[PDB]
Amino acid sequence: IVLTQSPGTLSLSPGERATLSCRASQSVSSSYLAWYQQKPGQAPRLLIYGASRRATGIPDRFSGSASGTDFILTISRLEPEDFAVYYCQQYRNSPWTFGQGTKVEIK
Amino acid sequence: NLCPFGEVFNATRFASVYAWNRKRISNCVADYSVLYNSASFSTFKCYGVSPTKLNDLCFTNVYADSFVIRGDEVRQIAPGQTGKIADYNYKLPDDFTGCVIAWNSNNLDSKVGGNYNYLYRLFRKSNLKPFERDISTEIYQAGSTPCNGVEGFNCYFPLQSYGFQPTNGVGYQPYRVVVLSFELLHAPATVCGP
Amino acid sequence: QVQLVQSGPEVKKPGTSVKVSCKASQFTFSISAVQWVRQARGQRLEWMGWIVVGSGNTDYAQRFQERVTISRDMSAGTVYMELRSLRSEDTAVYYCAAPYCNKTNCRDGFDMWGQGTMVTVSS
Ligand SMILES: *[C@@H]1O[C@H](CO)[C@@H](O[C@@H]2O[C@H](CO)[C@@H](O)[C@H](O)[C@H]2NC(C)=O)[C@H](O)[C@H]1NC(C)=O
Numbered sequence: 001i002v003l004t005q006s007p008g009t010l011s012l013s014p015g016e017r018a019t020l021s022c023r024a025s026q027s028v029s030s031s032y033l034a035w036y037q038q039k040p041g042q043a044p045r046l047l048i049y050g051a052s053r054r055a056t057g058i059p060d061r062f063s064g065s066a067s068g069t070d071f072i073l074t075i076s077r078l079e080p081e082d083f084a085v086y087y088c089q090q091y092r093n094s095p096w097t098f099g100q101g102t103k104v105e106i107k
Numbered sequence: 108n109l110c111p112f113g114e115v116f117n118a119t120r121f122a123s124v125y126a127w128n129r130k131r132i133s134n135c136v137a138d139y140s141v142l143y144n145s146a147s148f149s150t151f152k153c154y155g156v157s158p159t160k161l162n163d164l165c166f167t168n169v170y171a172d173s174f175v176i177r178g179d180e181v182r183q184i185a186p187g188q189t190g191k192i193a194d195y196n197y198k199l200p201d202d203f204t205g206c207v208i209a210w211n212s213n214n215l216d217s218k219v220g221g222n223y224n225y226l227y228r229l230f231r232k233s234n235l236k237p238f239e240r241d242i243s244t245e246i247y248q249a250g251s252t253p254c255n256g257v258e259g260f261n262c263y264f265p266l267q268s269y270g271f272q273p274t275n276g277v278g279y280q281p282y283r284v285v286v287l288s289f290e291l292l293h294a295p296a297t298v299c300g301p
Numbered sequence: 302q303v304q305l306v307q308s309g310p311e312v313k314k315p316g317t318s319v320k321v322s323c324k325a326s327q328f329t330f331s332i333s334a335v336q337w338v339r340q341a342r343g344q345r346l347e348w349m350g351w352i353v354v355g356s357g358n359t360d361y362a363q364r365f366q367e368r369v370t371i372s373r374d375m376s377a378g379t380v381y382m383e384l385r386s387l388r389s390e391d392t393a394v395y396y397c398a399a400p401y402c403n404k405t406n407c408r409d410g411f412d413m414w415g416q417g418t419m420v421t422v423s424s
Contacts, residue, residue, distance in 0.1 A: 031252040032260060034410040043396055043417050044346065049410030050252065056412075087346060089411075091260040094360050096336070098346045191331065229355045230332065232405055249332065249407035250400070260334070261400070261407055267356040 001025050003088045003099045010104040014078045020102045022071040022088040030067050032092035035099075039084040047086075048073060080106070110135035110298070112142060115171045116208075121216070121283055123226040124174040124196045125266060126242050132169035134297045138162075142208070149282065150181060153206030156289060161206065165299025166289035170205075172197075172238075173285045175216060175225055177269065179278040181209045184286065195228040195265075200237035205288040213273065213280040222271035225281070230265040238288070303327045305397045305415030312421050315388050321418050323380035323397035328413075330378040331355050333402035336411060337371060337382055341393040349395065354380065387422040394419055 004023045012018050022035070030051040038044035046055050048064040051071050061079075066072040075082060083106055088099025110132050122128040139162045143151065156164060176184070176192060183190040186203045193199075216222055230247040248254070249261035258264065271281045304326035313319045323335060337349035350361040354373040361369055370383040380397065397415040400408035 031409070032254075036411075038346075043414035045414065046410055046412045049408075049412075053409070055410070089346075089348070091336075091411075093259070095362055096260075096348045096351070098338075098348060101345050230405075249334070249402065250409035251406075252409050261409065263334075263353055263356060263358075 001028060001090060001093055001095075001097060003090065003097050005086075005088055005099040005102045007102070008100075010102065011107040012078060012104060013107050014080055014083075016078055018075045018078055018104065020073045020086055022099055024069055024071070024090060027068045028090050028092050030071075033071065033088065033090035035064070035071075035073055036087045036089065037084050038087060044087060078104075108135050110137040110169070112137070112171075115173060116142070116285060118173070121173055121175045121212075124176050124192060124284075125226055125228040127172050127174035127197055127240070129240075130171045130173070132171055132298065133167070137169065137298060137300050139300055148208050148210040149178075150209045151206065152185065152209075154186060155204035156206065158206060162300040165296055166204075166291045167294040167296040167298060168288075168290035168292070169298055170238075170288040170290060171285055172288065173283070175212065175269075175281050175283050176227075177278065178211070178280050178282045181282050181284065184209065184284055191229060192227065194234045195231045195241075196235075198235045198237060198239065199286070203237070203288070204291070205286065207284065207286045209282050209284045211277075211280055212283040213271075213275075216281045216283075217271045217273045217275070220272060222281075223268045225269040225271065226266045227269065228265050229267055230263055303401070303413060305399065305413055307395075307397060307415045307418045310419035310421070313387050315422055315424060317387050317422075318383055318385040319387060319420060319422075321382040321384065321395050321420070323382075323415060325378050325380075325399070329402060329404055330375065332404065332407060333399045334407070335371075335373070335380045335397060335399045337380075338396040338398060339393055340396065340417075341390075344393075346396070349382065352380065384420075387420075389423055391420060391422040 002025045006021045033051045034049040036044040037047050052064050061076045064073045083104050086102040180192050183192045186199050186201050246256045247263045247265045254262040306324040308322040334353045336351035339347045339349045352359045352371045368385045373380050394417040396417045398411035
């Protein structure tokens with residue numbers, strides 16, 4: 001399964017709502033995909049698993065939704081620490097390919 | 108009318124430890140002296156009955172449970188032990204009365220290239236009860252997400268096979284294990300030796 | 302201390318084999334499945350490949366089948382990745398991931414992530 005992420009770069013200011021989209025070439029079960037967050041410098045951290053579920057310790061501002069061939073995560077109010085890169089990863093059908101990455105930069 | 112120990116300690120094939128085969132022995136005279144002095148067993152660990160005076164005392168039923176395990180986990184077959192075998196495949200009660208016999212069978216069960224015909228259980232929702240026999244081969248759910256019997260993330264086949272091949276050392280060499288549980292109940296107790 | 306300790310940065314010659322190490326700490330290692338992930342400096346993550354520690358079942362990538370062997374060791378509770386025939390492109394960070402797994406149940410995703418190992422392969 002090939003995974004795509006959109007948009008390539010997210011030029012946005014802090015404080016507003018941003019949406020990140022992920023497209024899977026085939027219908028993949030929602031329960032078997034996650035998105036992670038990576039700030040350059042350390043290991044990427046898990047944010048959402050099952051494509052709609054809040055992981056432990058994360059702020060509630062991040063949220064996930066959508067189904068089938070479209071997956072969405074929305075950040076209600078954007079903080080300077082949120083400014084990092086976001087990855088997709090399904091782990092239903094091998095290979096469990098990662099998304100290309102969804103970088104956000106302060107406009 | 109000797110107890111048929113030959114059919115137990117000389118069977119051509121032995122069941123896997125997850126499906127350990129249980130044979131009931133009753134209404135026969137058991138010559139435990141031959142078993143005790145055969146001198147062909149790696150371990151004869153008995154609890155609750157003297158391995159020398161076992162002929163004299165006669166419990167009602169004799170449950171001969173047979174299977175095959177790798178050598179290093181043979182110590183796991185004992186009351187109060189823990190491990191993969193003692194928690195997912197076969198467990199003995201803390202107050203278990205009876206004796207256990209374990210002897211190497213590398214020249215008998217091992218095959219060139221690896222005898223992969225013997226299975227054991229690694230995953231279970233809850234630990235086994237004493238003498239509990241779980242033989243279900245359903246898919247295992249590591250997470251909270253039902254995956255409908257399809258292999259994948261957090262779906263694992265609970266059974267794994269043993270890589271028994273002649274190049275292995277003692278630790279990985281197969282060992283045939285026969286446990287004799289001496290069951291006492293409100294019964295005429297028709298089972299003792301000479 | 303639930304930790305995925307990894308070996309320090311390695312400097313290996315091309316064509317050699319490196320053992321990337323993943324030491325589990327403070328969480329039962331029998332039930333847990335470990336995936337390995339890769340990251341070139343400034344690039345994305347590519348999923349190195351995953352094993353189930355308890356049963357030894359493995360699954361590799363379609364393009365790294367021929368130089369990668371991921372094995373596990375319950376005696377020390379570690380996971381090793383053998384990378385044979387190293388080359389210049391191999392200079393990257395290698396990450397160990399594993400759901401938080403108790404004696405019987407696991408998390409529904411990859412949460413724990415080790416410090417990562419820098420590997421540099423050149424003459
Ligand atoms: C299992 O079979 C072996 C031989 O295949 C038995 O060993 C023989 O036992 C008889 C009587 O018990 C002796 O007369 C022979 O001298 C033994 N031969 C060898 C080579 O040991 C063995 O006793 C059998 N097991 C049981 C529990 O009866």
